[PDB]
Design an enzyme around this catalytic site. Structure first.
Site, short mmCIF file in Angstrom:
data_model
loop_
_atom_site.label_atom_id
_atom_site.label_comp_id
_atom_site.label_asym_id
_atom_site.label_seq_id
_atom_site.Cartn_x
_atom_site.Cartn_y
_atom_site.Cartn_z
N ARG A 54 -23.85 -36.07 47.45
CA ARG A 54 -23.06 -36.20 46.23
C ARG A 54 -23.95 -36.40 45.01
O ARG A 54 -23.55 -36.06 43.91
CB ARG A 54 -22.05 -37.35 46.32
CG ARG A 54 -20.94 -37.30 45.26
CD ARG A 54 -19.99 -38.54 45.30
NE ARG A 54 -19.56 -38.86 46.66
CZ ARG A 54 -19.79 -40.00 47.29
NH1 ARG A 54 -20.39 -41.01 46.69
NH2 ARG A 54 -19.41 -40.13 48.56
N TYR A 107 -10.99 -25.52 22.91
CA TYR A 107 -10.36 -24.97 24.10
C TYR A 107 -9.10 -25.74 24.48
O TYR A 107 -9.13 -26.96 24.61
CB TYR A 107 -11.39 -25.02 25.24
CG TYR A 107 -10.93 -24.40 26.54
CD1 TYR A 107 -10.31 -23.17 26.55
CD2 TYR A 107 -11.14 -25.04 27.75
CE1 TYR A 107 -9.89 -22.60 27.72
CE2 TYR A 107 -10.73 -24.49 28.92
CZ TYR A 107 -10.11 -23.27 28.90
OH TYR A 107 -9.69 -22.69 30.07
N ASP A 181 -18.92 -28.56 22.98
CA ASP A 181 -18.74 -27.52 24.00
C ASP A 181 -19.55 -26.34 23.50
O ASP A 181 -19.14 -25.62 22.59
CB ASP A 181 -17.27 -27.19 24.20
CG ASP A 181 -17.04 -26.27 25.35
OD1 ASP A 181 -17.94 -25.43 25.60
OD2 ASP A 181 -15.99 -26.41 26.02
N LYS A 206 -19.48 -19.08 32.49
CA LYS A 206 -19.52 -17.92 31.62
C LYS A 206 -20.91 -17.29 31.72
O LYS A 206 -21.25 -16.76 32.77
CB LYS A 206 -19.15 -18.29 30.18
CG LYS A 206 -17.87 -19.10 30.03
CD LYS A 206 -16.74 -18.62 30.89
CE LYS A 206 -15.53 -19.56 30.81
NZ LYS A 206 -14.56 -19.43 31.94
C1 LIG Z 1 -15.29 -22.79 25.43
C2 LIG Z 1 -14.78 -23.01 26.82
N1 LIG Z 1 -14.95 -24.25 27.40
C3 LIG Z 1 -14.50 -24.49 28.67
C4 LIG Z 1 -13.88 -23.47 29.38
C5 LIG Z 1 -13.40 -23.80 30.77
O1 LIG Z 1 -14.43 -23.53 31.69
P1 LIG Z 1 -14.01 -23.27 33.24
O2 LIG Z 1 -15.35 -23.13 33.99
O3 LIG Z 1 -13.23 -21.99 33.21
O4 LIG Z 1 -13.27 -24.46 33.72
C6 LIG Z 1 -13.68 -22.23 28.80
C7 LIG Z 1 -13.07 -21.10 29.58
N2 LIG Z 1 -12.08 -20.32 28.92
C8 LIG Z 1 -11.68 -19.03 29.48
C9 LIG Z 1 -11.18 -19.23 30.90
O5 LIG Z 1 -10.70 -20.56 31.04
C10 LIG Z 1 -10.62 -18.36 28.62
O6 LIG Z 1 -10.23 -17.23 28.86
O7 LIG Z 1 -10.20 -18.92 27.60
C11 LIG Z 1 -14.15 -21.99 27.52
O8 LIG Z 1 -13.99 -20.77 26.92
#
Ligand SMILES: Cc1ncc(COP(=O)(O)O)c(CN[C@@H](CO)C(=O)O)c1O
Ligand SMILES: Cc1ncc(COP(=O)(O)O)c(CN[C@@H](CO)C(=O)O)c1O
Ligand SMILES: [Cl-]
Ligand SMILES: [Cl-]
Ligand SMILES: [Cl-]
Lengths: 391, 391
Positions: A54, A107, A181, A206
């Site tokens: 962990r 977000y 973020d 991403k």
């Molecule tokens: C700017 C941003 N921050 C967080 C996230 C979420 O990340 P995950 O790994 O998907 O939990 C996103 C992702 N956004 C995408 C898919 O959720 C969207 O299409 O808006 C993000 O952009």
């Protein structure tokens, strides 16, 4: 030097054991050969000695070292996904009675964590316009413990004047935890920690993964906030699996080449769109004229491939199907930052509903594009065919 | 349109089932719901119906479709590595009494397969200079069955005149099987099947995987040769695992951006080395004056990152250690086609020993470079520091 750093970050012999990439060490149990080894491991269980799965294995340690090098932090916490990194990094620093101040372009699930989870635990949340700049000092309260940035903003792509925001925040509440973020920049096109931000959070889902086939969140903290982040996230059991950590390290290696192609292709698309009769607005931070473009030009070392634009009209349900259902190259999906081009529509009223204490300044349907690695002329031909379907 | 094809090749819904990438279907057993389903699967067991894991799962079918599309073939056989692809593709088309004509610049394990495995099985191998062109006609015997090309050549990088070789073979022996090891071009910089070659073989290990962490061979055949290739390789049990198949499809998606960077950086290094007083000769297909450069320019659509050069002297054993042991960014290892830069040395008599029936035309120590994704100025400074250690 960035491309060289991307290729080599985290790849030390203790992790790679003779290969180019780190080994994949899959484990819960990590074996102590002796009581002395167990004592040493226990003492150093948050400091890169094998202790328990962990806390991480060699594979995690390699990724953490790599993220810390690239984002200039003291430590990197790992999470099941980007949304988990946001929710748990905020939670790590708040207690009953505190107050969170978050950009209203954040977000949507990050907002929902604040309004549906934090509130029932005695933590309150206020909002600010992405371009508030120094006036944010007006909103800061004696119990404001966290200030949450996201630049460019989700969907609408507005860029903060982060220097003015940080400076204003440090005047009024110096010990506030400033967070960002930093997913759109992949943590490398905007060096958040070099601006006085305490913690840079990423959906490594991403661009870092880069291929739409892994989910993982990261949070890289300065020395001031690392230990609280690390231990409070750990009390919530937050971790990522070794294989996904490996794949994140592996994505780093091509991140430079990929981002340069995403920047190039998407800015070309957006230049064509800003000339287009059926386009009201183009929200691309690298595009002269976009909300905050000047800050982008000043504070960012490049662009990724995600942006948005506004159509001359609010498409009906029927127009939306005729438009979106019949692209040949763009696909409809959530997420972004992969090799393929994506398209998503948000109606102006839908955006307004996720802009707390604000309204929108557009009436056409908003199209968000992720520009992948396809030939950009093929992609323009696809968008042009799309426009013909709704003319 | 290649970049668009690389992004989309093999990615159909029957394989992806809603995700961007193909699913990973791990299987030996594949279940027949009814006797009729089992009969149908048996009839189509080499045609993309699920039958048995040794024939492939959806993950393999997806990669196979991708490779056939990108290389213009009728089918694609998969193998544990490049060396297995070479050995088993040649073996699939020969029998006692046959003769193989192979370029004397072939990869050394390919040569050893011929001399150590085929010879004792009654199959003879003869050799040709890589610049032989139309004069290969005079080497074709009544029992010549396979003509094996490799362009550029291993280590020394000579480029064949494929049009002249193919025309000469087809005049004498129209039904001969012409094969090429097309790894350097990753099957996409040189469209072998469009030149009249029957089978294009790759170590997908190299640029297709792209990250030095998977091994796999591929052989794409035209319609004339596919069924024999398919069935004789299957009789030797040749397959690849589903996960590596998936990782190969995934590598395709970034092959375009990666190769363009390998091309730009390797050409820069090669042009710099050609001016250097400690360099006698640069062997890079894209560099003017290199052997077969005119054919590379006419017949290829680009270059990758692998090439070699000859030093102005023969290094002593002490100089070899001084040079090789103290690079900061180049690493010593076999293989190539990854994100990181690599370096190996060979003395002229070592190359001569793997140039059957031929001598070498140089006397300095030969250095083979793989140019990865690091900043090229960092790589040049690494090479300059090496030159200083042996000046
Ligand atoms: C700017 C941003 N921050 C967080 C996230 C979420 O990340 P995950 O790994 O998907 O939990 C996103 C992702 N956004 C995408 C898919 O959720 C969207 O299409 O808006 C993000 O952009
Ligand atoms: C031109 C060429 N063809 C085949 C192979 C073998 O591929 P594997 O997947 O490793 O079996 C190679 C590889 N040669 C490399 C690795 O040994 C080298 O260092 O020369 C190849 O180059
Ligand atoms: Cl202690
Ligand atoms: Cl613990
Ligand atoms: Cl069978």
């Amino acid at each position: 030097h960035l491309d060289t750093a991307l290729v080599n970050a985290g790849r030390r012999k203790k992790y790679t054991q003779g290969s180019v990439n780190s080994v994949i060490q899959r484990a819960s149990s990590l074996v102590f050969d002796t009581v002395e080894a167990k004592k040493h491991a226990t003492r150093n269980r948050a400091k890169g000695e094998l202790f328990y799965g962990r806390r991480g294995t060699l594979t995690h340690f390699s990724l953490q070292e790599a993220m810390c090098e690239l984002e200039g932090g003291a430590g990197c916490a790992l999470f099941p996904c980007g949304a988990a990194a946001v929710a748990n990094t905020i939670l790590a620093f708040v207690e009953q009675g505190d107050h969170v101040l978050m950009t209203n372009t954040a977000y949507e699930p990050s907002q929902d964590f604040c309004t549906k989870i934090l509130a029932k635990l005695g933590v309150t949340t206020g909002w600010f316009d992405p371009l508030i700049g120094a006036d944010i000092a007006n909103l800061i309260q004696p119990n404001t413990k966290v200030v949450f940035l996201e630049s460019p903003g989700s969907i609408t792509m507005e860029v903060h004047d982060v220097p003015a925001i940080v400076a204003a925040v440090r005047r009024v509440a110096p010990e506030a935890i400033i967070m960002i973020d930093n997913t759109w920049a992949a943590g490398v096109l905007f060096k958040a920690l070099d601006f006085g931000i305490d913690i840079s959070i990423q959906a490594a889902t991403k661009y870092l993964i880069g291929h739409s086939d892994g989910m993982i969140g990261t949070a890289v903290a300065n020395a001031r906030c690392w230990e609280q982040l690390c231990e409070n996230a750990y009390l919530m059991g937050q971790m990522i699996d070794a294989d996904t950590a490996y794949m994140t390290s592996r994505g780093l290696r091509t991140l430079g080449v990929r981002l340069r192609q995403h920047h190039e292709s998407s800015l070309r698309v957006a230049e064509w769109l800003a000339q287009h009769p059926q386009v009201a607005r183009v929200n691309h931070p690298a595009l002269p004229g976009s909300k905050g473009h000047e800050f982008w030009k000043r504070d960012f070392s490049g662009s990724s491939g995600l942006f948005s634009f506004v159509l001359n009209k609010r498409l009906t349900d029927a127009e939306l199907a005729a438009y979106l259902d019949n692209f040949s190259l763009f696909s409809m999906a959530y997420s972004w930052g992969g090799f393929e081009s994506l398209i998503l529509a948000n109606q102006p009223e839908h955006i307004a509903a996720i802009r707390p204490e604000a309204e929108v300044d557009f009436s056409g349907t908003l199209i968000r594009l992720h520009i992948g690695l396809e030939n950009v002329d093929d992609l323009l031909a696809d968008l042009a065919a799309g426009f013909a379907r709704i003319v």
